[PDB]
Amino acid sequence: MQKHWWHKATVYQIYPKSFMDTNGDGIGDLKGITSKLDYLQKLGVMAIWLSPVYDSPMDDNGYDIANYEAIADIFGNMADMDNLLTQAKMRGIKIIMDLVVNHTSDEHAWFIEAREHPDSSERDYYIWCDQPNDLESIFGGSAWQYDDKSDQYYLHFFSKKQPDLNWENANLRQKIYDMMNFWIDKGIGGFRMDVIDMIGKIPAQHIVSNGPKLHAYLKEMNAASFGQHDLLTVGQTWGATPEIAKQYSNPVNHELSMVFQFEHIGLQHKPEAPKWDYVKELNVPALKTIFNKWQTELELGQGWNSLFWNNHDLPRVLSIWGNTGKYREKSAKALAILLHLMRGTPYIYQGEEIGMTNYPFKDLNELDDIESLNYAKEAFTNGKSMETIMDSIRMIGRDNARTPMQWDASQNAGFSTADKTWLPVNPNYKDINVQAALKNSNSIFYTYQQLIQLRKENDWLVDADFELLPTADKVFAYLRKVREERYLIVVNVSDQEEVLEIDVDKQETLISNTNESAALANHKLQPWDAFCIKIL
Ligand SMILES: *[C@@H]1O[C@H](CO)[C@@H](O)[C@H](O)[C@H]1O
Ligand SMILES: [Ca+2]
Ligand SMILES: [Ca+2]
Ligand SMILES: [Ca+2]
């Protein structure tokens, strides 16, 4: 297999509104982001996933884009963007632009010209209809919004202020590619293609994900954009099996670098139930099955897979699958080690490296996410009490991932110098902040640092195969094997003392959050024990 720069990279995702504020309005800035590039470089990340900073009414907080080639003035101007690119480049860090091309804002020029002047060419950039079907919006209600000015329903799989783009229109596609080339020529490191599995939509036939012309569109995109350059393109794929992932990310097909898939995330809720009917107790054997499926059936050279616990749309991994009290940091290290020592590109969400958690939202007002608000308003008149709803949201609501980045124990955790922040800062910033994590030599942060370094310096993380070992239910253990080399990874995914019935000859320790000698000797693991050792 022929390697690329991103085959040894670890990606750090920054949520701009909640990273660092430097003008005291309670919202994060581009300058705030640039001011922490030394911290990110110290962490050892190679690429930064930058959540949308484009012009937006912020209906879906940046994912309703009104202009792809302008910076929202709440984040600064284009000069700030270019400066961020430059300063990150100087520190060996590439910027990966988050991109939404399935739909735009309704305040985007294309749509404005489209519902005005229905004789425009922009009219066909969007999906217009006379006789709507039963397609529902992911954020609730119908997917068709009746515009009474033009007497036509337009398609929106998300909010009504997020009309879908018509990807059967090659001219629209062309303009998209024009924008992409615009950002590419600004010297970015790649793209995160959000929801990109939806561009092959045929709404008339009730087709959303995995369309028939999907990979043709992705091939066209590649050939017209990043296909010539050397960029990391990660696509978010909802309908994703290992074979589909192959179709997406096999280097021969000339489409994407890798996929971003949520099958293991699906274990956060009951089978085929809405994500609001959550499950705290993680089914670790199920996670073993899924992880093994994606580690084995996605062979080297035939595709590449992403490694992630959480992002801006998910609950922080500690609140859903980890520990938030006694073994908080230990559980965080355990999960980190567990995920990062598999094959693929690991993704770290901001604050995960210090082990941040979900926020204790008590009432509906202090929320912001349109998805949570819609779910709440529906469920309230659908037999659910406000307390049940608030519990469900406290567990699963996306706002839990969008609370300000906790840096220190200053005002607003050193995120902002304003009276209030756009979202509340979690009180645990008393204990959970970047300064304190940096001070402690053996903190979660340095575990992530060590993992990222091991990924940078050692080829086996890319080269070694994967073999699942038969352990206890809540014990996740595997082998990375390549040539003479054999690496054992052992992680106790439990709050309780578990069993380890194995004998190995330990040659050296690569990483450990506990006494691995004790665990190997007494054949039993303490809660959240995790290590990686080289064995003979
Ligand atoms: C993908 O796009 C959706 C819709 O704009 C947004 O809500 C998510 O946050 C993003 O990941
Ligand atoms: Ca600001
Ligand atoms: Ca009318
Ligand atoms: Ca102030």
Side-chain angles (χ1 to χ4, degrees):
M1 187 186 62
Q2 294 299 338
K3 320 294 185 64
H4 285 262
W5 66 267
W6 45 259
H7 268 97
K8 297 185 177 299
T10 305
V11 181
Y12 190 98
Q13 176 186 10
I14 288 182
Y15 197 79
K17 291 187 70 172
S18 298
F19 193 75
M20 183 61 187
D21 176 31
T22 54
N23 61 325
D25 55 346
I27 310 173
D29 324 327
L30 283 177
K31 293 182 185 178
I33 300 178
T34 307
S35 64
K36 294 297 179 180
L37 293 178
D38 278 336
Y39 162 75
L40 293 181
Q41 183 184 20
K42 172 64 178 178
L43 176 51
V45 300
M46 197 169 306
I48 294 175
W49 170 359
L50 180 56
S51 287
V53 292
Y54 323 92
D55 187 25
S56 174
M58 305 300 178
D59 188 44
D60 194 16
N61 289 279
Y63 286 97
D64 45 322
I65 306 175
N67 191 4
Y68 288 105
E69 303 181 2
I71 299 299
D73 42 34
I74 200 61
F75 296 130
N77 70 331
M78 189 60 65
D80 301 331
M81 181 77 268
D82 301 341
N83 181 33
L84 173 57
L85 278 163
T86 299
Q87 296 306 312
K89 181 180 177 181
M90 289 177 173
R91 291 168 182 77
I93 299 174
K94 304 195 187 309
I95 302 295
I96 295 180
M97 297 300 287
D98 195 326
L99 218 53
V100 162
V101 295
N102 175 85
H103 58 268
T104 66
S105 172
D106 62 328
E107 302 181 25
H108 192 292
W110 295 344
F111 193 71
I112 293 184
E113 177 67 18
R115 60 161 174 218
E116 285 182 344
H117 307 159
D119 308 317
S120 294
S121 55
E122 293 83 343
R123 183 73 183 194
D124 203 40
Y125 287 5
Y126 299 88
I127 306 292
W128 293 98
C129 177
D130 282 15
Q131 305 286 339
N133 54 9
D134 62 312
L135 289 180
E136 317 180 54
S137 169
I138 305 173
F139 292 157
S142 185
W144 299 105
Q145 177 58 45
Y146 184 84
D147 183 35
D148 55 9
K149 179 160 174 131
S150 53
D151 292 29
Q152 270 194 332
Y153 298 85
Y154 66 87
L155 181 68
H156 66 102
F157 278 112
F158 299 91
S159 86
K160 290 157 193 204
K161 302 199 66 182
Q162 276 172 305
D164 272 42
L165 290 175
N166 185 20
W167 271 79
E168 293 180 301
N169 195 334
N171 305 273
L172 184 273
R173 304 203 299 269
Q174 178 57 52
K175 300 213 66 181
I176 293 301
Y177 305 151
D178 284 13
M179 161 258 307
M180 292 180 53
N181 287 325
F182 158 83
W183 280 107
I184 288 172
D185 292 356
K186 268 197 164 298
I188 58 178
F191 288 110
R192 180 264 184 165
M193 316 257 73
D194 186 16
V195 124
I196 206 65
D197 58 306
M198 291 181 61
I199 65 177
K201 54 198 166 186
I202 313 185
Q205 305 183 28
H206 294 69
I207 296 180
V208 187
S209 283
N210 299 111
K213 293 307 181 179
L214 160 68
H215 301 288
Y217 294 159
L218 289 183
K219 276 174 165 58
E220 176 174 284
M221 168 176 298
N222 178 276
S225 328
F226 47 82
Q228 311 178 73
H229 309 72
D230 190 30
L231 307 176
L232 198 175
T233 57
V234 44
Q236 195 181 251
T237 314
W238 188 75
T241 64
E243 300 302 321
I244 306 177
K246 280 185 180 180
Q247 183 56 42
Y248 273 94
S249 67
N250 193 311
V252 185
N253 302 343
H254 290 90
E255 303 190 24
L256 307 176
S257 295
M258 70 197 61
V259 301
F260 212 89
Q261 151 260 355
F262 302 86
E263 180 177 345
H264 62 297
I265 308 302
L267 292 169
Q268 294 181 2
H269 67 81
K270 299 175 180 176
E272 294 212 27
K275 64 173 183 178
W276 306 104
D277 203 317
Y278 60 88
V279 180
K280 182 180 172 62
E281 245 279 323
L282 166 63
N283 195 328
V284 174
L287 187 76
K288 290 162 67 176
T289 303
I290 301 177
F291 278 175
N292 190 48
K293 179 201 305 180
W294 282 88
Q295 282 295 292
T296 53
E297 301 175 9
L298 207 46
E299 293 99 313
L300 203 59
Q302 290 188 333
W304 202 254
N305 197 24
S306 309
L307 297 168
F308 75 101
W309 287 121
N310 52 353
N311 54 32
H312 68 296
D313 293 335
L314 301 174
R316 295 190 173 268
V317 64
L318 286 182
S319 296
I320 173 65
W321 280 342
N323 190 279
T324 56
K326 286 184 52 185
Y327 314 102
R328 185 188 69 88
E329 312 176 24
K330 197 161 181 290
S331 51
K333 296 179 185 177
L335 296 165
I337 291 174
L338 173 59
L339 181 72
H340 277 233
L341 297 182
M342 290 179 293
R343 178 164 66 207
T345 305
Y347 286 75
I348 305 172
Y349 187 62
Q350 57 176 49
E352 176 197 336
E353 70 276 7
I354 67 176
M356 287 176 55
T357 76
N358 287 7
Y359 179 86
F361 297 99
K362 251 78 207 158
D363 65 90
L364 197 63
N365 164 78
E366 56 172 353
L367 294 176
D368 178 275
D369 181 27
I370 177 174
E371 185 194 47
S372 293
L373 304 181
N374 286 10
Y375 159 77
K377 263 164 281 301
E378 178 187 7
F380 183 77
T381 52
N382 213 335
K384 261 81 171 187
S385 75
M386 188 55 58
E387 238 309 305
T388 293
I389 292 174
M390 284 309 299
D391 175 74
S392 189
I393 287 178
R394 272 191 299 269
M395 188 67 162
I396 304 296
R398 297 187 298 178
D399 287 320
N400 293 284
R402 308 178 182 182
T403 55
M405 182 70 175
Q406 306 164 193
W407 297 96
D408 51 37
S410 294
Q411 176 191 355
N412 312 326
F415 159 78
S416 185
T417 174
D419 303 8
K420 298 202 305 176
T421 54
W422 83 280
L423 275 184
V425 181
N426 194 318
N428 62 24
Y429 88 99
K430 175 195 310 175
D431 307 89
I432 312 184
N433 62 86
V434 171
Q435 182 184 19
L438 285 175
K439 177 166 186 173
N440 188 16
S441 181
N442 290 263
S443 73
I444 313 170
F445 173 84
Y446 291 99
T447 294
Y448 275 103
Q449 176 180 72
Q450 289 173 228
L451 290 173
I452 297 176
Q453 189 178 20
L454 289 177
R455 161 155 275 94
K456 277 180 172 181
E457 300 172 354
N458 299 274
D459 295 320
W460 64 267
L461 275 93
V462 177
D463 292 331
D465 50 35
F466 185 95
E467 183 175 16
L468 194 65
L469 296 165
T471 64
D473 282 338
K474 290 174 284 188
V475 178
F476 196 123
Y478 59 92
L479 293 179
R480 302 296 299 281
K481 310 169 298 185
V482 48
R483 313 184 312 267
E484 64 143 296
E485 302 178 4
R486 226 165 185 167
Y487 300 99
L488 171 65
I489 292 87
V490 178
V491 177
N492 189 353
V493 204
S494 170
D495 286 314
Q496 294 297 101
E497 191 182 24
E498 300 292 344
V499 71
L500 183 61
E501 296 170 359
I502 193 184
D503 289 83
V504 285
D505 213 331
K506 175 172 48 60
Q507 298 175 320
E508 58 174 322
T509 297
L510 285 75
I511 191 171
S512 184
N513 70 340
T514 183
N515 195 289
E516 66 277 19
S517 297
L520 264 62
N522 303 348
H523 290 84
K524 269 179 273 161
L525 301 147
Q526 291 318 117
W528 300 108
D529 267 12
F531 51 85
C532 175
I533 60 180
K534 187 170 179 295
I535 60 179
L536 182 60

